[PDB]
Amino acid sequence: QVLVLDGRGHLLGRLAAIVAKQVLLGRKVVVVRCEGINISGNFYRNKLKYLAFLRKRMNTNPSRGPYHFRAPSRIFWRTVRGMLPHKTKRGQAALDRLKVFDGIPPPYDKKKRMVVPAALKVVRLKPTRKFAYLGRLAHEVGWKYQAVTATLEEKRKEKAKIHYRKKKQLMRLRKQAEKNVEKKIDRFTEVLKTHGFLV
Amino acid sequence: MKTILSNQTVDIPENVDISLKGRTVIVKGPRGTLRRDFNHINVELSLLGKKKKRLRVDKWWGNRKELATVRTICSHVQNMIKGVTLGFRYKMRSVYAHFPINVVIQENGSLVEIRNFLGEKYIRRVRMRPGVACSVSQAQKDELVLEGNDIELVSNSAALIQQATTVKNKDIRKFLDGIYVSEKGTVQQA
Amino acid sequence: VFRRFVEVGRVAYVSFGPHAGKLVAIVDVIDQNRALVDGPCTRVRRQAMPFKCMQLTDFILKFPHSARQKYVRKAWEKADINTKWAATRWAKKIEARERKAKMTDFDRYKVMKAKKMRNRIIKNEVKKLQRAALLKAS
Amino acid sequence: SGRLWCKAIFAGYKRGLRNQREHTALLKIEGVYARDETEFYLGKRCAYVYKAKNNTVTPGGKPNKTRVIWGKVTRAHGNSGMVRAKFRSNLPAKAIGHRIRVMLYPSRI
Amino acid sequence: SHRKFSAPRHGSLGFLPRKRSSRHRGKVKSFPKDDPSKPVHLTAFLGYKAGMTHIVREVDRPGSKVNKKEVVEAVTIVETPPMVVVGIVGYVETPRGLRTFKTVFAEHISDECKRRFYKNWHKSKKKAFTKYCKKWQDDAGKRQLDKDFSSMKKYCQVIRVLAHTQMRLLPLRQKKAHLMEIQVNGGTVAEKLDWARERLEQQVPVSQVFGQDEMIDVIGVTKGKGYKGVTSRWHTKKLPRKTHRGLRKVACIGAWHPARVAFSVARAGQKGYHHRTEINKKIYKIGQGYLIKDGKLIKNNASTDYDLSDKSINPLGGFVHYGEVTNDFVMLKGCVVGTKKRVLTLRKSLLV
RNA sequence: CGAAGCUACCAUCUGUGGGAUUAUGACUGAACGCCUCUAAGUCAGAAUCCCGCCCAGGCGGAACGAUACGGCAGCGCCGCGGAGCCUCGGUUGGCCUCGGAUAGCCGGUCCCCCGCGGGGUCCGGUGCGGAGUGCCCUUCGUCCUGGGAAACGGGGCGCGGCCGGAGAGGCGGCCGCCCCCUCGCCCGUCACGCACGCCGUUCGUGGGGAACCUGGCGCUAAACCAUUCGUAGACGACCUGCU
RNA sequence: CUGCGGGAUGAACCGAACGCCGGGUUAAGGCGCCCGAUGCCGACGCUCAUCAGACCCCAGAAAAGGUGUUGGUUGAUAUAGA
RNA sequence: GGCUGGGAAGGCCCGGCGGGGAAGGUGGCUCGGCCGAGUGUUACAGCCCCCCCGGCAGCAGCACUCGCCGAAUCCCGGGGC
């Protein structure tokens, strides 16, 4: 009942608009691996844009000024808040519904995550154009925990590789069992495929 | 406009063997192996001819800037073939007026120490890229030879050791000192 | 690495448009993103069509690039494109999807019962195979 | 024994940029996202169900705390599967982005 | 218009939360980065400032005008009794930060360390760590402790040791010992944890942590000065005597168009009692405390190979407003932050 | 003349390291059979920018200690029960590879290398994805007996051991012993207030919060004020002592 | 002396002028989110900007240049070999 | 219903005429097993395309939806508010 999205390979604003629209309608959305998000344009242009955003600060008391969050997850949260009416109660509730994580935590590391083709780089961006990784931008703008997140993600990738090997072995065993047992379930697969299955 | 098709072919010699893992070209032969990931270029790399005779580069519906990449890929492949077969040797002769530039190779070829450049007490220690070997050549008083398979690495190391010897706050048109690349050839001509 | 090329005489499946879900043979190329196409054996008239709406298959019948609606039909009949297309797995899964779409409520109930029984039998067999493999490993 | 109604999200009132009409709500029905599959849901009854403190009457059962607001689907709304609904009492705007039940028994099948 | 004659600003913008420190003991904001090649060693210690005095020595810097000449340097004495290790703690690196994983305390804990856990010692019943020490006297508790240590060895990245000062050996009135986490830098995590476990319920002298002729950092709270005006807090220029509404004040605060007072304007407020971390303090001498073989041995404190006297670092009548130093001490070049009796944190240098 | 305390470049001590790059200088290299720092790609690069050192520390988290023996008490974990106020969302779940797009998915691997598993070559099947989220998993009436296909499966918040899991673990797996049941798929066989057409039916729920009735196993307070001290101080606050 | 829809904002701009309402359709304007609607399997081309660009009044730029790139006009020479 | 009394197209084709892309052909070369594939040169038609002579129901704005104007040359039925 909760959307789980993989931030890797998605465009920043393209994914943020969809996430904001979904979370306005009461849908709970969780986004993982926000460092995998990539923004169109060259990295130097994106870095200059974020440096201008940093330069935007309250002159008399910067403590009250804009809060420039460096973590990619908080950057995505802020760009969704910029599309949400955060001044109102409905906007605040949508922000509370939305959850963003750096990398992918154990609460969601063992959950299948959806992919939005309407915000993917390969879908919406020409292959001859350049793009900048949000993780690289965050690291060069002030993020601290890039290497730790990378190591934890590598450990999770190894564990998921082991799990996928086990699942693939299970599927191969299931195929062998089906091949060995089809004689006594011929009358079931037949009625299954008469209606458009297993074909 | 968009050109329907651009194609080029490189006929590799029988000595070397090349392979393509999708878009990564690996070339092997006598001297060693060279790998180059030719992604981000959006071309079709085919390997045709029995005994792996020719490598074909195709570009479909590309603009002018995209068509410009086929020949650069072919040039890179030819440079890799030349490096694998014969190798790359850069000879650079030291040029000076009064102070003799002293060049000492330290580990094998990796560390190059440059002393007595314009009388400076500071020693210029320069690293060489992996694979490139630096040595002091014979039959010439002040000449350094850089040998390697990767032309990019050898030339980058030569550029580094050339830009290290830079004259500061002077007239370069008068102070013609430093180490400059003189000849760019092959280790063996055959 | 390409296996399908837009060649004169290649069959293509119309993904969307007026003549959706039909085979049609490319006769001539009109522009960068437009091709002349003919469907004499598939109830499609000679017309221009963009490449976006057509997905080219792996069937290539040979006829001249400006055939007058008859030689293309003769080549289509000689090659018997309809039967080979029906035999291909693409049309089989297309028909399976159509059958699933046309499934009714009683058919849905029968399918549910059959799936239940078949899945239970398959799960029992898989469990027996797993325990046998574990015993072999031990 | 199961669900005999479709799920819909109360997207909001019929509104312009700076004016809203509270007498016409917008319903986003799950599963339909084009103005071709919305012909089935035209004229369908819809209900907004909410529970309150004080107990109320309940047909065919003991009094409960649950109450509903009934309404009818009039027409579709702009090529995206959104539909217009008119309720006897206007929705309280507390149900913005909340679930409502589109019943299936103004049947025309 | 513009300022006619340019002048640098008063005070540092990087040091101006001008508030009394919430903590009284100096906090190590950053420990040295641990290289997994050197042996295990504690990176910090906790001493107490006693006083200052002179030192006379010959310098050995060639080329200087004062080379091979007698010079005098002001030296600050920090009494540093050995600290008792009472616990260990593991830290695991997380994408959010450095989260504490597991804290394991020792079986026996001294009353000096127990005093810290109680705001009121006279009123309390002294029940701290009453059921916790049962874990060290039961098989189930021993198994749980072994499992906790194994988990710390497997998962934790950073290991720190809880050590408390010995307030008994000091002339200070207070008896509440100061506890502190000291990060252990050394070999692998397993060897580090084994060394920390071995050092449990044990004394740690200053010779183990620091050596002679070493550059360290001193962390502590500035001697407080209470509410102060701008002329003393930021050392601004004094207005002329002819001023009507005061002269020890900042004259112009800000411009008109920005209708707010900037945070960079020098204002009157709290001066002193600020947390500070002085760097590059040189250890001139780590002096041994009073020890007895047949009688008192006080020469080791102040006697040198060129003085060969029977003097201790304590002056005549003892140190003023501190007491008499009888334990091991460290003599640092120059002055250090804080007043007398003040607890200071000595940290190894973070730089090559 | 002058103790203590404050104070003076009017005495004394200390003041740091990386990353990305600007201008620029370059490598390979076509466009443009030649040449080119640029179009793809790559190198060096600074009082620059960011981070590190340093100050504060979020309607932000951390693990750990004690948790009111009393002269009336009050609590913490377990299990299965009864009403009793408030607050509500809902109306089966999916327990998971990395990844590329001018390419990928699956086996066997006769063959080789490496720690049952991984990598490489070859071969064989799909690729507008049927090892398809255009998807999969479970059925959503009950009970009697009386046959067939299939069949040793499940349950008693079943009781005891062995593990995986630290990112914000909070869930699952693997083995022993007691009892009970014949459940999935097709056919007969009846009966279930058949409430006579009328709506919030149907569930995640033994939902979350507050006040009261059953037992077993464990508990014994600390904080503040008052007093005192000056490392602190306008008052608060802060560092301390007191069977 | 004038409300209303749009131009984010607003005297004079565009549409359009006012009793209280229900249904339908528009103008000027728009349809990624804020914010109602392109959540079309929209069509054809141009554009890389380390100062891109984004809609009357209107809130901003000139002369001069660029083989950066995409088209057009004219003029020569090239198998007697550019 | 109208049009260029619609334009082309679909089928049987028949007796001629010229031109062009450049093909069961020839042919320099290249790649694999006489054959298959890719390039070039004159070039008839045994791959075809176009024009001129001349005729058959197969039409009809055609569910082979290739591109209009429409209504005493126009009527019926159904759904939603």
Swiss-Prot record, chain B:
GO biological process assignments: cytoplasmic translation
Which Pfam families does its entry note?
Answer: Ribosomal_L6
Where would you find this protein in the cell? Cytoplasm
UniProt keywords (A-Z) are: Acetylation, Cytoplasm, Ribonucleoprotein, Ribosomal protein
Q: Name one GO molecular function term.
A: structural constituent of ribosome
- Superkingdom of source: Eukaryota
The UniProt entry, under PROSITE patterns, shows:
RIBOSOMAL_L6_2
Q: Name one GO cellular component term.
A: cytosolic large ribosomal subunit
| Main location (coarse class) | cytoplasm
Query: Keyword Ribonucleoprotein, does the record have it?
Result: yes
Q: Which residues are annotated with the PTM N6-acetyllysine? A: 121
Keyword Transmembrane annotated: no
The transmembrane segments are: none
Cited SUPFAM superfamilies: Ribosomal protein L6
Subunit structure, as described in the record: Component of the large ribosomal subunit.
State the family it belongs to: Belongs to the universal ribosomal protein uL6 family.
Query: What's the stated role of this polypeptide?
Result: Component of the large ribosomal subunit. The ribosome is a large ribonucleoprotein complex responsible for the synthesis of proteins in the cell.
Q: What is this protein called?
A: Large ribosomal subunit protein uL6
> Which gene name does the record give?
RPL9
From Swiss-Prot, chain C:
GO molecular-function terms, A-Z? RNA binding; structural constituent of ribosome
GO aspect biological process, one term: ribosomal large subunit biogenesis
This protein is called: Large ribosomal subunit protein eL14
State whether it acts alone or in a complex, and with which partners, per the record. Component of the large ribosomal subunit.
Tell me where the cross-link Glycyl lysine isopeptide (Lys-Gly) (interchain with G-Cter in SUMO2) is found.
Answer: 123
Similarity comment: family membership? Belongs to the eukaryotic ribosomal protein eL14 family.
Keywords for this protein: Acetylation, Cytoplasm, Isopeptide bond, Phosphoprotein, Repeat, Ribonucleoprotein, Ribosomal protein, Ubl conjugation
Its biological function?
Component of the large ribosomal subunit. The ribosome is a large ribonucleoprotein complex responsible for the synthesis of proteins in the cell.
Question: Entire protein: which part is shown?
Answer: 2 to 139 of 218
List residues, modification N6-succinyllysine: 84
Acyltransferase keyword on record: no
Q: Which cysteines are joined by disulfide bonds?
A: none
Where is the protein situated, by its record's location annotation?
Answer: Cytoplasm
Native source species: Oryctolagus cuniculus
What GO cellular-component annotations does this UniProt entry give? cytosolic large ribosomal subunit
Keyword Repeat in record:
yes
Positions bearing N6-acetyllysine: 78, 84
**Modification type Phosphoserine: residues:** 138
From Swiss-Prot, chain D:
- List UniProt keywords, sorted A-Z: Acetylation, Cytoplasm, Ribonucleoprotein, Ribosomal protein, RNA-binding, tRNA-binding
What is the protein's known function?
Component of the large ribosomal subunit. The ribosome is a large ribonucleoprotein complex responsible for the synthesis of proteins in the cell. Required for the proliferation and viability of hematopoietic cells.
- Annotated protein name in UniProt: Large ribosomal subunit protein eL33
Which branch of life, at top level? Eukaryota
Q: Which family does it belong to?
A: Belongs to the eukaryotic ribosomal protein eL33 family.
Q: Does the keyword Transcription apply?
A: no
Sites where N6-succinyllysine occurs are at 62
Instruction: Tell me the residues on which N6-acetyllysine occurs.
Output: 7, 62
Molecular functions (GO terms):
structural constituent of ribosome; tRNA binding
What GO cellular component is one of the record's annotations? synapse
Query: HAMAP family given for it?
Result: Ribosomal_eL33
Q: Does the keyword Ion transport apply?
A: no
Gene Ontology terms: biological process: translation
Q: What is its main location?
A: cytoplasm
Report quaternary structure and partners: Component of the large ribosomal subunit.
Q: Where in the cell is it found?
A: Cytoplasm
- InterPro entries the UniProt entry points to: Ribosomal_eL33, Ribosomal_eL33_CS, Ribosomal_eL33_sf, Transl_B-barrel_sf
From Swiss-Prot, chain E:
Q: Which residues carry this modification: N6-acetyllysine?
A: 135, 285, 293
What InterPro entries does the entry give?
L3_arc_euk (IPR045077), Ribosomal_L3_dom_3_arc_sf (IPR044892), Ribosomal_uL3 (IPR000597), Ribosomal_uL3_CS (IPR019926), Transl_B-barrel_sf (IPR009000)
The name on file for this protein is Large ribosomal subunit protein uL3
Pfam families, per the entry: Ribosomal_L3
Give the organism, scientific name. Oryctolagus cuniculus (Rabbit)
Assembly notes: Component of the large ribosomal subunit. Interacts with DHX33.
UniProt-annotated location(s): Nucleus, Nucleolus; Cytoplasm
> Of which family is this protein a member?
Belongs to the universal ribosomal protein uL3 family.
Which residues does the annotated region (Disordered) include? 1-36
